[PDB]
Design an enzyme around this catalytic site. Structure first.
Site, PDB file in Angstrom:
ATOM      1  N   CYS A  38      44.614 -31.362  31.320  1.00  0.00           N
ATOM      2  CA  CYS A  38      43.565 -30.900  32.271  1.00  0.00           C
ATOM      3  C   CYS A  38      42.197 -30.994  31.595  1.00  0.00           C
ATOM      4  CB  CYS A  38      43.909 -29.496  32.742  1.00  0.00           C
ATOM      5  SG  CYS A  38      42.597 -28.703  33.694  1.00  0.00           S
ATOM      6  N   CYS A  41      39.719 -28.063  32.427  1.00  0.00           N
ATOM      7  CA  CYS A  41      40.074 -26.822  31.689  1.00  0.00           C
ATOM      8  C   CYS A  41      39.256 -26.771  30.399  1.00  0.00           C
ATOM      9  CB  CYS A  41      41.571 -26.746  31.383  1.00  0.00           C
ATOM     10  SG  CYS A  41      42.613 -26.610  32.863  1.00  0.00           S
TER      11      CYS A  41
END
Ligand SMILES: [N+]
Ligand SMILES: [N+]
Length: 115
Positions: A38, A41
């Site tokens: 991700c 993130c």
């Protein structure tokens, strides 16, 4: 599987039973769902640590979605990162995607009204 990286403020959640115990507390809590795979993130990592210092009355709790799919499925998390805001076991709000200033504003506004 064992480690202890020095993070003064942000908690890592390791089980559904630990999540349910934290979220049930009479405390404003922000659960931040993240995963290795991700990119967005990674943008939230430093802002989350700064927020945790900014709002000491708040528990910031990280949930690794790959390690804790049961917590992901329990809350219908569809995108990472997602931040869920909770208190004494109730869902108060969320922020989907890498929007650290919106999350700051939502936490600030709830705290303002708790006075
Ligand atoms: N988020
Ligand atoms: N929740």
């Amino acid at each position: 599987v064992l480690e202890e990286d020095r993070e003064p403020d942000v908690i890592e959640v390791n089980s559904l039973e630990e999540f349910d115990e934290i979220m049930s507390m009479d405390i404003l809590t922000v659960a931040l769902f993240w995963a290795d795979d991700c990119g967005p993130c990674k943008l939230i990592e430093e802002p989350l640590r700064k927020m945790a210092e900014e709002f000491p009355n708040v528990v910031f709790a990280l949930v690794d979605a790959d390690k804790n799919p049961e917590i992901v499925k329990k809350l219908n998390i569809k995108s990472l990162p997602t931040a869920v805001i909770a208190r004494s076991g109730e869902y108060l709000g969320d922020v989907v995607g890498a929007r650290p200033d919106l999350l700051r504003e939502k936490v600030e506004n709830i705290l303002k009204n708790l006075e």
